[PDB]
Amino acid sequence: QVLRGTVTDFPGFDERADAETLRKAMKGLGTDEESILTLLTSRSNAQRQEISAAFKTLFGRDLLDDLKSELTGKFEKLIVALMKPSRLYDAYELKHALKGAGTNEKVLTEIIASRTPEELRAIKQVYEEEYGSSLEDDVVGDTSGYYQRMLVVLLQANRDPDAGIDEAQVEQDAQALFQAGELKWGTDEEKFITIFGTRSVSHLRKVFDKYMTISGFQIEETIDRETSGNLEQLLLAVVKSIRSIPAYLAETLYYAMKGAGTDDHTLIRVMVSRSEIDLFNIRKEFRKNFATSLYSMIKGDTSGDYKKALLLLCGE
Numbered sequence: 316q317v318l319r320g321t322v323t324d325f326p327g328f329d330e331r332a333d334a335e336t337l338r339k340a341m342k343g344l345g346t347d348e349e350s351i352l353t354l355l356t357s358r359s360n361a362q363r364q365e366i367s368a369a370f371k372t373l374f375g376r377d378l379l380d381d382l383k384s385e386l387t388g389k390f391e392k393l394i395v396a397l398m399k400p401s402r403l404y405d406a407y408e409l410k411h412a413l414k415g416a417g418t419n420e421k422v423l424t425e426i427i428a429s430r431t432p433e434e435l436r437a438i439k440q441v442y443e444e445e446y447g448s449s450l451e452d453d454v455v456g457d458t459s460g461y462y463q464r465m466l467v468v469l470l471q472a473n474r475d476p477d478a479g480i481d482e483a484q485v486e487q488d489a490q491a492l493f494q495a496g497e498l499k500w501g502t503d504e505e506k507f508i509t510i511f512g513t514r515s516v517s518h519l520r521k522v523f524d525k526y527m528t529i530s531g532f533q534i535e536e537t538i539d540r541e542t543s544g545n546l547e548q549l550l551l552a553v554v555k556s557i558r559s560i561p562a563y564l565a566e567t568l569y570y571a572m573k574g575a576g577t578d579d580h581t582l583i584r585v586m587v588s589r590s591e592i593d594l595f596n597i598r599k600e601f602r603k604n605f606a607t608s609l610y611s612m613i614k615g616d617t618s619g620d621y622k623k624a625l626l627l628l629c630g631e
């Protein structure tokens with residue numbers, strides 16, 4: 316489709332005027348969170364970077380250090396996320412899922428499955444730049460088995476082009492997946508990793524259809540979500556992303572709020588990282604799949620300034 320974000324460049328932007336408002340909001344005893352909230356969610360990421368620059372040229376101060384000293388809580392985490400340069404943000408969040416004891420597999424899967432090969436090539440490059448090390452080495456460092464192998468394949472950013480549907484291979488592949496799926500995805504993993512990882516998106520959507528007509532089922536049905544198995548989670552994310560990235564991300568949001576409490580980390584990461592890409596399309600998938608709006612779901616799951624900020628990111 317045509318991807319539509321919910322945040323665009325503010326017309327009539329003046330980074331100096333904005334820098335002064337933020338300075339005033341912060342200056343002295345207490346904070347005007349409401350003024351910060353509304354300013355920042357109504358400027359695009361590139362404008363926020365122009366505000367930081369102007370804040371340091373006027374005041375000799377660092378805006379992000381200031382925000383971090385003035386704010387707290389989930390509101391702080393949301394604001395700091397917004398302030399990240401768009402080009403770094405996916406990298407940063409991968410770096411945080413990997414760095415330390417254990418791994419945050421959830422974030423690894425989500426970003427690596429739902430970002431396009433072009434996004435991935437850029438994240439790899441920025442990760443190396445920023446963090447000194449290769450994303451691929453750090454992933455191999457943290458993960459094992461076919462989960463690791465399948466991430467590394469996706470990390471090569473080399474899917475076949477969408478050109479010729481070789482309906483002979485479509486039938487072969489669909490049969491291969493039929494077999495493997497009946498076998499609970501636990502045999503011949505090497506076969507399917509190559510099919511999921513390297514075939515073109517238009518091929519694979521053909522495979523999924525063909526599959527269903529062979530089995531009667533949708534290939535997702537042969538996996539169950541809430542329970543375990545990193546490779547299965549990864550398989551499910553890839554199949555959903557091949558179908559529709561905004562649908563898969565809408566579902567990740569739904570489940571970030573569904574149940575006791577919220578996965579605020581996920582809610583923040585998706586709302587921010589997609590705000591200027593496809594968040595509008597995500598809003599429409601959510602509504603049609605989950606028969607409620609994202610807005611009301613956020614409004615019911617969150618509170619305070621953190622909630623106001625998110626509802627202004629979201630829209631309607």
Ligand SMILES: [Ca+2]
Pocket residue numbers: 341342343344345346385
């Ligand atoms: Ca203050």
Ligand SMILES: [Ca+2]
Pocket residue numbers: 345346347348
């Ligand atoms: Ca206040």
Ligand SMILES: [Ca+2]
Pocket residue numbers: 382383384385386387388391
């Ligand atoms: Ca703080």
Ligand SMILES: [Ca+2]
Pocket residue numbers: 412413414415416417418457
């Ligand atoms: Ca680790």
Ligand SMILES: [Ca+2]
Pocket residue numbers: 572573574575576577616
């Ligand atoms: Ca909840």
